[PDB]
Design a protein around this motif. Sequence first.
Motif, PDB file in Angstrom:
ATOM      1  N   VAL A 111       7.804  -3.248   4.008  1.00 59.77           N
ATOM      2  CA  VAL A 111       7.048  -2.609   5.305  1.00 59.77           C
ATOM      3  C   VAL A 111       7.838  -1.310   5.657  1.00 59.77           C
ATOM      4  N   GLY A 112       7.184  -0.620   6.651  1.00 61.17           N
ATOM      5  CA  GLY A 112       8.116   0.770   7.120  1.00 61.17           C
ATOM      6  C   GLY A 112       7.142   1.813   7.315  1.00 61.17           C
ATOM      7  N   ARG A 113       7.590   2.832   8.417  1.00 61.65           N
ATOM      8  CA  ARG A 113       6.965   3.767   8.639  1.00 61.65           C
ATOM      9  C   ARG A 113       7.957   4.856   8.913  1.00 61.65           C
ATOM     10  N   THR A 162       0.880  -1.202  -0.049  1.00 58.55           N
ATOM     11  CA  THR A 162       0.116  -0.002  -0.058  1.00 58.55           C
ATOM     12  C   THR A 162       0.813   1.280   0.151  1.00 58.55           C
ATOM     13  N   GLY A 163       2.040   1.143   0.191  1.00 57.83           N
ATOM     14  CA  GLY A 163       3.083   2.164   0.365  1.00 57.83           C
ATOM     15  C   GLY A 163       3.350   2.968  -0.714  1.00 57.83           C
ATOM     16  N   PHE A 164       3.836   4.098  -0.742  1.00 53.83           N
ATOM     17  CA  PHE A 164       4.372   4.932  -2.054  1.00 53.83           C
ATOM     18  C   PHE A 164       5.254   4.083  -2.883  1.00 53.83           C
ATOM     19  N   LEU A 165       6.476   3.399  -2.411  1.00 57.31           N
ATOM     20  CA  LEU A 165       7.181   2.677  -3.308  1.00 57.31           C
ATOM     21  C   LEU A 165       6.306   1.493  -3.732  1.00 57.31           C
ATOM     22  N   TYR A 202      15.606   5.688  13.225  1.00 55.03           N
ATOM     23  CA  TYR A 202      15.089   5.066  12.162  1.00 55.03           C
ATOM     24  C   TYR A 202      16.378   4.218  11.439  1.00 55.03           C
ATOM     25  N   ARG A 219      -3.375  -4.496   5.636  1.00 57.25           N
ATOM     26  CA  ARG A 219      -3.574  -4.293   6.886  1.00 57.25           C
ATOM     27  C   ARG A 219      -4.973  -3.267   6.932  1.00 57.25           C
TER      28      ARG A 219
HETATM   29  N1  LIG Z   1      11.117   7.455   0.996  1.00 61.53           N
HETATM   30  C1  LIG Z   1      11.887   6.412   1.725  1.00 61.53           C
HETATM   31  O1  LIG Z   1      11.809   6.317   2.812  1.00 61.53           O
HETATM   32  C2  LIG Z   1      12.861   5.483   1.027  1.00 61.53           C
HETATM   33  C3  LIG Z   1      12.504   3.812   0.973  1.00 61.53           C
HETATM   34  N2  LIG Z   1      13.074   3.141   1.861  1.00 61.53           N
HETATM   35  C4  LIG Z   1      12.018   1.853   2.606  1.00 61.53           C
HETATM   36  O2  LIG Z   1      10.950   1.483   1.537  1.00 61.53           O
HETATM   37  C5  LIG Z   1       9.822   0.888   2.091  1.00 61.53           C
HETATM   38  C6  LIG Z   1       8.622   1.392   1.422  1.00 61.53           C
HETATM   39  O3  LIG Z   1       8.599   2.723   1.066  1.00 61.53           O
HETATM   40  P1  LIG Z   1       7.154   3.643   1.345  1.00 61.53           P
HETATM   41  O4  LIG Z   1       6.035   2.957   0.597  1.00 61.53           O
HETATM   42  O5  LIG Z   1       7.327   4.925   1.134  1.00 61.53           O
HETATM   43  O6  LIG Z   1       6.825   3.270   3.024  1.00 61.53           O
HETATM   44  P2  LIG Z   1       5.264   3.303   3.412  1.00 61.53           P
HETATM   45  O7  LIG Z   1       5.365   4.727   4.623  1.00 61.53           O
HETATM   46  O8  LIG Z   1       4.441   4.039   2.415  1.00 61.53           O
HETATM   47  O9  LIG Z   1       4.606   2.221   4.193  1.00 61.53           O
HETATM   48  C7  LIG Z   1       5.024   0.966   3.714  1.00 61.53           C
HETATM   49  C8  LIG Z   1       3.827  -0.177   3.993  1.00 61.53           C
HETATM   50  O10 LIG Z   1       4.160  -0.446   5.414  1.00 61.53           O
HETATM   51  C9  LIG Z   1       2.625  -0.546   5.885  1.00 61.53           C
HETATM   52  N3  LIG Z   1       2.709  -0.799   7.490  1.00 61.53           N
HETATM   53  C10 LIG Z   1       2.803   0.241   8.370  1.00 61.53           C
HETATM   54  N4  LIG Z   1       2.817  -0.319   9.563  1.00 61.53           N
HETATM   55  C11 LIG Z   1       2.810  -1.824   9.383  1.00 61.53           C
HETATM   56  C12 LIG Z   1       2.428  -2.695  10.159  1.00 61.53           C
HETATM   57  N5  LIG Z   1       2.645  -2.845  11.567  1.00 61.53           N
HETATM   58  N6  LIG Z   1       2.454  -3.842   9.660  1.00 61.53           N
HETATM   59  C13 LIG Z   1       2.253  -4.063   8.404  1.00 61.53           C
HETATM   60  N7  LIG Z   1       2.337  -2.988   7.582  1.00 61.53           N
HETATM   61  C14 LIG Z   1       2.607  -1.718   7.955  1.00 61.53           C
HETATM   62  C15 LIG Z   1       1.868   0.299   5.426  1.00 61.53           C
HETATM   63  O11 LIG Z   1       0.437  -0.005   5.681  1.00 61.53           O
HETATM   64  P3  LIG Z   1      -0.423   1.228   6.430  1.00 61.53           P
HETATM   65  O12 LIG Z   1      -0.272   2.409   5.940  1.00 61.53           O
HETATM   66  O13 LIG Z   1      -1.940   0.866   6.704  1.00 61.53           O
HETATM   67  O14 LIG Z   1      -0.040   1.379   8.083  1.00 61.53           O
HETATM   68  C16 LIG Z   1       2.276   0.654   3.962  1.00 61.53           C
HETATM   69  O15 LIG Z   1       1.560  -0.269   3.050  1.00 61.53           O
HETATM   70  C17 LIG Z   1      10.259   1.816   3.623  1.00 61.53           C
HETATM   71  O16 LIG Z   1      10.078   0.666   4.453  1.00 61.53           O
HETATM   72  C18 LIG Z   1      11.415   2.216   3.406  1.00 61.53           C
HETATM   73  O17 LIG Z   1      12.457   1.740   4.773  1.00 61.53           O
HETATM   74  C19 LIG Z   1      14.464   3.146   2.017  1.00 61.53           C
HETATM   75  C20 LIG Z   1      15.236   4.192   1.750  1.00 61.53           C
HETATM   76  C21 LIG Z   1      14.438   5.434   1.052  1.00 61.53           C
END
Ligand SMILES: NC(=O)C1=CN([C@@H]2O[C@H](COP(=O)(O)OP(=O)(O)OC[C@H]3O[C@@H](n4cnc5c(N)ncnc54)[C@H](OP(=O)(O)O)[C@@H]3O)[C@@H](O)[C@H]2O)C=CC1
Lengths: 320, 104
Positions: A95-97, A27-30, A145, A50
């Motif tokens: 995953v990530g936040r 669901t995230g941006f990437l 982080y 989720r």
């Molecule tokens: N711009 C950046 O930060 C860069 C990218 N990365 C890594 O790329 C990854 C993805 O990027 P991005 O899409 O922007 O990250 P996002 O903030 O968009 O989150 C990615 C996904 O993780 C889900 N998420 C959050 N908490 C949980 C949880 N407890 N359990 C399951 N899912 C969860 C979110 O769903 P929900 O919204 O419902 O919580 C979301 O779908 C990141 O993890 C990042 O570490 C690494 C270097 C630079």
Amino acid sequence: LHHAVIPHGKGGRSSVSGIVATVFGATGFLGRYVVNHLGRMGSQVIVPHRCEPYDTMHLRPMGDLGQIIFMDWNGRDKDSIRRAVEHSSVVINLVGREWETQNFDFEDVFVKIPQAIAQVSKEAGVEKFIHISHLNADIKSSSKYLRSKAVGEKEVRETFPEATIIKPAEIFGREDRFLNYFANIRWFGGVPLISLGKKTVKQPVYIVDVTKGIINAIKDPDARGKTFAFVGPSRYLLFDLVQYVFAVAHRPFLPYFEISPFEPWTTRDKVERIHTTDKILPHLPGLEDLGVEATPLELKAIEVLRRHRTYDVQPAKTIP
Amino acid sequence: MNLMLALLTNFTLATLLVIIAFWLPQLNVYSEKTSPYLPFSMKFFLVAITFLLFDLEIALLLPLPWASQTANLNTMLTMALFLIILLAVSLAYEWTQKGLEWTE
Ligand SMILES: NC(=O)C1=CN([C@@H]2O[C@H](COP(=O)(O)OP(=O)(O)OC[C@H]3O[C@@H](n4cnc5c(N)ncnc54)[C@H](OP(=O)(O)O)[C@@H]3O)[C@@H](O)[C@H]2O)C=CC1
């Protein structure tokens, strides 16, 4: 390759590629680009999630009939994780936040959740795996982080020794929270508060560049077990970027928000990453190795901030 | 006071609904949206002025109800109709001279 995954077609929307990809946190941006690129060629995709099923709708057009599946799972649970990875030809963890909640702190999303996923893939005998690490990973780093991230880079390299951990630098794109972070959050209703952004070096990368890299990694057989980092082709200074941004965004500039419920903006720890320098790692293979060229921020920054631009700009000077 | 306080509350209440309606939906994280994208025609200006002049003569009629109480009624009645007829002519002029183009 399995009998049902043999390549077929011409790689269009309804052509069968043979890549049964399971994306975690798509669901995230990437993710949405990775899903879209996987969907582009018609590869079978499973998408655990989720949030509400409503929030996954925008992914639906990205895939043909019966190529996109929206299961449910929970990081704290591993029974759900097993179902989504039982027959996947590869598994991707995204995953990530950018902030911590009272449910999942940085470690949980950056250490256990990346791990728990890795083990089950080994248990299930997943043939491949991808993991998104951070370029600036180090246990002695300041940014929790990053310090939380640095732990995850180790277990993933241990639980799944063949998992291709990737460490991209700052990413930008249409929905990114980096270029959009400066333009709106930093300035709106508030004069810039940059704390002498003169020493920092930032080397962001384009989201499409990262997306193409991941897919190429999946195809490659020799990419197993390696580790990559993706960095734009031109380095920059933090202060130079912000000033240049307001030129494209045409916002007034004056060189030099707390943590709350919802999605916080301008968090305490997020600052450290903006100031934290981008590591220089000449030895790690990068985008150019994956048959992917970095796209200069000059070419593509126009589209992202075009919306910020309400209703002939010299490109930002580089720093070696 | 009384009128002031009443006037203050009306607009005081008005803004709150405006503020709450505008701002409260902001804290709802509906993702983010993409970006969307004169000939001075004579007819429309003529009515603007025509309204003004005709409106002005109204201000001269407003005293009428008080004027009817005057012991000098022969004059008052004569003049009272004087303005109205002059107002009548004003419209009459525009109509015959093709002035009311917007009416068409
Ligand atoms: N711009 C950046 O930060 C860069 C990218 N990365 C890594 O790329 C990854 C993805 O990027 P991005 O899409 O922007 O990250 P996002 O903030 O968009 O989150 C990615 C996904 O993780 C889900 N998420 C959050 N908490 C949980 C949880 N407890 N359990 C399951 N899912 C969860 C979110 O769903 P929900 O919204 O419902 O919580 C979301 O779908 C990141 O993890 C990042 O570490 C690494 C270097 C630079």
